Amino acid sequence: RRLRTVGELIQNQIRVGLSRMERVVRERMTTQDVEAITPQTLINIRPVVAAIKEFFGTSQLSQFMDQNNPLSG
Amino acid sequence: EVIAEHPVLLNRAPTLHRLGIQAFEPQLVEGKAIQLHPLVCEAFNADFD
Amino acid sequence: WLSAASFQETTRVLTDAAINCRSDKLNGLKENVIIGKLIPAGTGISRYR
Amino acid sequence: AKRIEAGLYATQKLAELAEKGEKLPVQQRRDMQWICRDGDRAKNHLLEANLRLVVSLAKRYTGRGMAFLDLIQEGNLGLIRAVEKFDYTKGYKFSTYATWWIRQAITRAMADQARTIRIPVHMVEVINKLGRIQRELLQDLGREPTPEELAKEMDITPEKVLEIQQYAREPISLDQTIDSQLGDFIEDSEAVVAVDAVSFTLLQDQLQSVLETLSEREAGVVRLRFGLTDGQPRTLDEIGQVYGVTRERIRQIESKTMSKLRHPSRSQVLRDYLD
Amino acid sequence: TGPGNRPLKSLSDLLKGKQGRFRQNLLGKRVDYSGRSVIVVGPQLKLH
Amino acid sequence: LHHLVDDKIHARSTGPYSMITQQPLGGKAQFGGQRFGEMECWAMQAYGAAYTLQELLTIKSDDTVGRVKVYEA
Amino acid sequence: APVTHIWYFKGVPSRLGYLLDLAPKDLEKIIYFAAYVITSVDDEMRHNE
RNA sequence: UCGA
DNA sequence: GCATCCGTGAGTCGAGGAAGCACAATTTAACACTTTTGTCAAGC
DNA sequence: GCTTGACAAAAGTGTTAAATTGTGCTATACTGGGAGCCGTCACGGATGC
């Protein structure tokens, strides 16, 4: 039984953001013009940053720092 | 003047039996806390913690 | 039928009551509580009131 | 395609015969109606064959708030008009022309339906362009473009873009839990308050006593003017027909009774009722 | 399901459960003329 | 400890009401009333007091015309 | 086009199932268009031919 | 997520 | 006829924190103009 | 005590310039979703095998 740390928990959300992006890139590279498109044509980072923003909020692991005293924090 | 001989009902949750609710005569007291009779604690199962 | 509906398995109780075209006489006290009537017990007996 | 057009033309020819009579030979009349039979079977066959193209196009539009099946069916509607408007003489594959109608049917459906508060097509059009212009300015500037940059790129005023961004607001479910759900936190605004309702009655009681001390004809003018008992505020001319005076004579009565009402003996008690 | 995979509440969901119309808004209710606070010993009080 | 009387004391006579059901709301932030629950009704029925129970569940909470009339009385 | 209530059909035991002597597995196939059903046959005309 |  | 599997239930109050255009149809505003109303002054 | 006429404001009111709104259409060829689910526990009774 292992402990998933803060850095690893964020990693899993970045993975989901990148996987959610390739669906747009894979669908974009085929039907988007030809030969001149390059990453500027279609690389939509909206799903990537959304995975980060949607994680720090609404997630049970990310909580408001509990601070009544320096001990509780 | 209006408080005089006007009863109120006190409740301590959870209410297991009917003695969890009892009527008392109010006595205006300072502060924000409530003063409870020490004998009725067994009925309410109310600790002072 | 509404006393069993408020108790448990509300979905099953409702379909059975509607199929049998059941009628509730509103006798028990849990019924009178839901409709806002005087429960038929204690001071609510047909005599005392 | 030729079977469909033949069956349609054959159907219209017989329709021209219904009004004009001229019952054709029974062998020709039976064959004409078989062409219409075959024309409809040709239409149904062409749709059932290209029912999968609709599905292959509708996969990409999911997750937007429209259920998969609804996207598929709306795409099928685009396929119907595609077959109805398709032309076989141009020598182009059917999938070439049908792709346009299926995408248009799916997108047009999303703009007219998927939003709980429906938004017209032209407003949905400006929002999507506003979003694309905002996503590109993000890639260019590395920061979210403020409305001034968005209004500039869009050829519209800055005060208009925020209003358009206000329309983009989407409703939230009252049943969302955050254990008791949000719906329990909304207080009824039109719910009657006890104090104000009881105060309004005591206020009605006080006005009766104040208005009771006055000329019976002066009190009547004030009651009709503001409506009071009736509820509909009248006008000077309407009050002039009941008391048989000109609208000017009532304004004189209205002014004299008002200065008598403003005078402190009557108004000293009504100060608390300002609000 | 709604946004974020939240199942929509249905007419049957309104009656059923501890949160339904029965055990929530029928067999119990929130009332006026009431309050709460902590309790302290009242050793000098009469039983009533 | 962070548990203080000034925060916990709450009192209400009349206040905001719920929209779908006319019962008051909960919490001190909403100025709501105390919940009289299923187990508390059992204790009220054990004593055999019908008028006190009916009062709590009608004019105290859900009766739209009864609460304004009680306040008027 | 009509629709089943799903309270009587899906609710166990199936009310439509016990009413028409139909199995729930088969009844689901019928109302959701997973298979056909014979609404009526002509027993006399079939016998003549 | 905590208090009895 | 029997057993595997679906359906229902498992404490009470609190407290708190997140594509694009064209074109026809239509309703909305915008304006010129008349009636209806509140008004000031003078005299009967 | 009331009325007059002239008088300005307001209130409509009908008519026109305008914005808003709904529907149709786009012709290389393109044809069967992807999402996911692990930690009850005890029980009853249908349903399914």
**3-state SS track over D8-64:** HHHHHHHHHHHHHCCCCCHHHHHHHHHHHHHHHHHHHHHHHHCHHHHHHHHHHHCCC
Q: Which of D62, D176, D179 has the most E C-beta neighbours within 10 Å, making it the best mutation to test the interface with E?
A: D176
Q: Resolution in Å, one decimal, please.
A: 3.2
Distance of residue D196 Cα from the nearest chain F Cα, in angstroms:
10
F19 CB within 8 Å of a chain B CB = no
- Rounded-to-integer distance, Cα D70 and Cα C40, Å: 54
Point out the residue nearest to J28 (C-alpha to C1'). Answer: D96
B46 annotated binding-site participant: no
**Residue D76 contacts residue D53 (beta carbons within 8 Å):** no
CA→C1' distance for E26 and I10 (Å): 21
CB D188 within 8 A of CB F18: yes
CA distance A18 to F1: 46
- In angstroms, what separates the C-alpha of D205 from chain F's closest C-alpha? 14
- Pair of tokens at residue D223: 């009651």
From the list E11, E13, E34, E32, the residue with the least C-alpha distance to E24 is E13
Give the total residue count for chain C.
49
F56, F23 contact by CB (below 8 A): no
List B10's β-bridge partners, or say none.
Answer: B22
| Nearest residue to D174 (alpha-carbon basis) of F65, F21, F60, A9 | F21
Quick one: tokens of D32? 């004409």
* Ramachandran assignment for D155, one of left (phi > 0), alpha (psi -120 to 50 degrees), beta (any other): left
Residues of F in contact with E23 (CB under 8 A): 38
Q: Enter the tokens of residue D161.
A: 């873009």
Number of Cβ pairs < 8 A linking chain C and chain F: 33
Among E residues 15-44, those touching chain F with beta carbons less than 8 Å apart: 23, 25, 27-38
For this PDB entry, the determination method is: X-ray
Cis upstream peptide for G13 (omega within 30°): yes
Give the tokens for residue F50: 């019908």
DSSP letter (8 states) at residue D273: G
Q: Which residues pair with F35 in a beta bridge?
A: E30
**E strands in F6-62:** 10-12, 35-36
Neighbours of D175 (CB within 10 A): 16
Q: Does F22 touch chain C (CB under 8 A)?
A: no
Q: How far apart are CA F15 and CA D262, in angstroms?
A: 35
B38-44: long-range contacts, CB 8 A cutoff, minimum separation 24: B38/E41, B38/E42, B38/E43, B39/E47, B40/E47, B43/B19, B44/B10, B44/B12, B44/B19, B44/B20
The C-alpha R_g of chain D, in whole angstroms, comes to: 36
DSSP, res F13? S
Residue D64 neighbours by CB under 8 Å, 6+ apart = D110, D114
Which of G9, G15, G16, G19 is most worth mutating to test chain C (most C CB atoms within 10 A of its CB)?
Answer: G15
CB burial string F25-48: b at 16+ within 10 A, e below: bbeeebebbbbbbbbbbbbbbbbb
